[PDB]
Each structure stands twice: as structure tokens, then as C-alpha cells.
């Protein structure tokens, strides 16, 4: 089993630009047995190139595949919104590559931060959850730290990030701080501090038990 | 793997749409991909390991002797066919084994003028130009299209050991 | 046309067995090699195994040797994937793919051109539990719903039973330490909409046939 390395990990380009995606094998392979595949979020993969250069049926001509020996490159010129996805290479009957992700590059947008206290319906149970919403920001790189009574937290939070929006090409993050009812009622002030490129200073959205 | 620089021992090169092979002379049979010897009519103790057909030799059974195809060949009407080519139809051509493939696969190699039609299970039905790659370096020989396969033969004026 | 339909997924305890299948139609099944490709949640594609057209040649990835077994029945045009002693890392969507070639300019170029819809396998000792919905009361404001402690995936979240798709974000779920999934779903509306328009979220969880419609309203 050979090892295929794809570069870059995440490629951020604007529509209309040229995209170059690399796939390097640990050994040497015949170009007839190294194919390219495309996958949309939530969809099955789709073949792009029979072998290294033969476009599969229905694949637009702007997709071009080239490569020999250990170096293989998929070239996507004149990028369109439908082209931004995840791309894989595979040796036929062997392993895949780690995959290169194509993300739309747009204007830097700061996240609008919202914090949500645990509802009364949840406080009846033994656990409580305070949610921090980072909405419509770009790029996806962002940092969230919870501070209860001005104290950093760890092992009690989980984060999720939506796919890139098909409308404004932004990202959204959700951080949930799960604490028991005893530890929630024990303190008072809860806040999530957010750091992002679109913010000159980290923004804190706080609340107190009783609004 | 057969190439244009292959010397078919007691044979000659032919070309189809996707591969080259060696055809034997007269009633000779292929002992390997590039060598033709005489087929033994009946296997016994003296003709052990001797060719009895295309890609088949004499084996000893522990005491009798029979003619069996080489590993990876299936006998279909007394001729050895590659395993992954038994259930593969090609129409205007034949099925061949893709030697370089990581997985055992049968592919269609077509008569001159056809190519595997991806919209017809890769059978030989789509029209396609196949340029002759044969290097006919004998005296007054050239690549002629004979019965759907490329081969070396005499030119427009010469005919028949050396073309004259 | 060519069709690949997969079945055999579902929840199974750690160390259990499963038999996946892939029904093929629209082509001579026996002449094409078949493949299994899986993808764990949030991860990339991983080739599992490949079988030749006659089934006499089989190929396996190192990560699946020993446990997994690939086979085919050309009389029924069906591909199979037999597994025993399933590990927790086997949770993935399992696709089948047809392996064919395209003769382009002197060479036989191969690839997996036809894929199936994929069947989901889930290895866990957790039991099927319905979701519990909690409001996210707003103080353009933002409100949402918290779908907490459901199993297994997935849950479909809508707002006002449709007709509210602008500015909605249903975040991906996270696998909590207890083995239960939990995701949030928020929607942004102008502050001049609170108190005049009712906002409800429809959390439909098929594995338990649970549909909760929890309304969100500003706090007092």
C-alpha cells in the first residue's frame, strides 16, 4: 500500500481563478491507475479523471489532469461556485489521498457573537448548557474560550462549524458549555471570548444568571 | 509485455487497437508471450513440461499426463483464455488481460478502426483511428491492414523468405 | 441506466457482525471489478477492498484485513461486504463503486465512475434515544434550538415547518462523552420580529420516530 500526499490542505480561491491541486505518491505509479474524484458535502464522490488525464463523462473541460511518475496535478481553471468542493486522488485498487478542500475566498467578515443561557426547561434536569454563537465570519479560523467568573475552561466545551454558506460564503461556529446544575447555580457571570481576524480586539459576550 | 521492439521467436508481430501480440508460424503454438514452439500431440513421460497449446504445457499427475493451461488461464473450447476474460465480450475484437493493472481486469482490444466504446460497456463499437506503431524493417516491408489487424507485409510491388 | 443500491447498515454493538450488500443493475455485472469505499464522519475517503470481475481476485486494505471480507454473486449481480468483530472506528458511510476503464489515446485509464448512495454503519453500545429540545431565548437578534442527547444520527431541523430558510444554520452534531449526539440550530431575524411572529423548530428524529415542535420566545 502506497501513501498519497495531497497539497495544499485547504485551498482558498475566488471564483474565476485557476486552481492547482497536487497529488504525490510515495512510489511510482502508472498514470492509467491514478484517478481524481470530487465530492460535495452530503453527496457521493464522483469520478473526475479516468487515469491521470482522461476526463470522465459530464466533467467540464475546465478540469484538466496531468502527471507522471510520482507527481500528479489536477488543474481547475476559471473556477465556478459549483467547483468548490473536496478533491481526492486514488491509486486504483489502493489508498486515497488525504483530500484537498477548495473554499471560496471572500472579504474578511467579523463574527456577530451571541450567547444563550440555559433554558428553564433544561434546568429541571441535572445538566445545563450555555451556547455561544459565532455567526457569518470568514475565514473559518476562530478561537473560543469560556470564562466562568473569569476562569478559562477545558474539557467541558464542544464546537461545530457549518459548511461554507452557498449565499455569502461565510462560516458559523457553535460552542456549547455543558455544566451540571450545581456548578451553574454556583457561579454568576458566564462569557465566551472570541478571537478572529476581523476583530481588532477579542470580543466578549457575557451574561448573569437573572436577566 | 509485448512491445514494438519484441522479437517473436518463430513468430511475427500484429497490432490491434490497444495491444501487440505474437502470432505463431504454421501450426506452432505460444509457449510464452514472445516465443513459438511446436505443440506436442500427446503428453507422456518424455514430453514433460513441453508446450501442447497456446499457454499450456504437459503436467504429470501422481501416473498420468495431461495438457493444462498455465496459472491464470481458463480452457474454453480447447484454447486457453485468461481468467478475467471468460465473461467479457468485445464484438469487433478480443478480450485481453491488462498486465499493468493492480487488480486483475479484462479489457477489450479492437480490430483496426474501432476503439472501446465507454457508452457500450467498453465493447468494440466506437469508430477510432489506430495508428500503426509496427516497425517493419525487413526488405521492402511495410505495415498493412490485413483482416482487421496490423501486420508487416510486402509493399505495393514486391511479394513473398524475402519480399520480391 | 447503471444503478448501485446499497443496504445492510444500521446500529450494532461493539464487536458485532454486519453484512453489507450492493445491488447492481444496468450493465453486465460480471465484467467489471467492484469496490468498497468508506468515509468516517468528518474524515476523508478510505478504500476498503476491491474484487475482480470473476471474484477470483480479491484485494484488501491493511486497516480492514482479517475482519472484513468482500465477495460477489454474479448470478444475482450483487456485491457483498462481510464483517466480524466490528471496531468503534468502523462507523462510516460505506459506498460501492464500479471499476471500469476509458481507452483514451493509446492507454486504458481506470477509475471508479459509478457509485452507490452509501449505507451507514454505526458501532456503539448506546441505545436509541429520542431528542430533547431546549429553547435559545434571544436577548438583528438570534434565536435557536438545542437538540440534546439523541441517538443515533440523524436529526432534521426546520423552522416554522418551512417557509423560514433565510439565515438558518443547523450546525453539525458532536458525539458527547456519554455516547449521545447533540447539535444546535439557530436562525437570525431582525429585532423588530420578536413578540409579533411565533418561532418554532421542528426536530424530526426518524430512528425513534420523534418529532418535537418547541417554540422559542424572548425571556422575561
Numbering used by the authors:
A (entry chain L): 1 to 211
B (entry chain A): 2 to 63, 67 to 164, 169 to 172
C (entry chain H): 1 to 139, 147 to 227
Sentences from the paper on this structure:
The TBV candidate antigen Pfs25, which has been tested extensively in human trials, is a glycosylphosphatidylinositol-linked protein expressed on the surface of ookinetes. Pfs25 is important for ookinete survival in the protease-rich mosquito midgut, assists with penetration of the mosquito epithelium, and aids maturation of ookinetes into oocysts. Comparison of the structures of Pfs25 in each complex to the previously determined Pvs25 structure 13 showed that Pfs25 adopts a similar overall structure as Pvs25, in which four distinct EGF-like domains assume a triangular arrangement and disulfide-bonding patterns are conserved. We delineate the atomic structure of Pfs25 as recognized by six mAbs covering two distinct regions defining functionally important epitopes.
In addition, contacts between antibody 1269 and Pfs25 are dominated by its H-chain, which contributes 889.5 Å2 of BSA and 17 H-bonds compared to its L-chain (239.5 Å2 and two H-bonds). MAb 1269 exhibited the greatest number of H-bonds of the site 1a mAbs, which together with its high BSA, helps explain its highest-binding affinity for Pfs25 compared to the other site 1a mAbs. Interestingly, an intricate H-bonding network between the HCDR2 of 1269 and Pfs25 residue Glu88 led to a unique rotameric state for this antigen residue compared to recognition by the other three antibodies against the same sub-site, resulting in a more electronegative surface targeted by 1269. As 1269 is the only site 1a mAb that co-resides in the site 1b and 1c bins, it is likely that site 1b and 1c mAbs also recognize these unique EGF-like domain 1 residues of Pfs25. MAb 1269, with an IC80 of 63 μg/ml (95% CI, 53–75), was significantly more potent than 1245, with an IC80 of 263 μg/ml (95%CI, 211–348), in accord with the higher binding affinity of 1269.
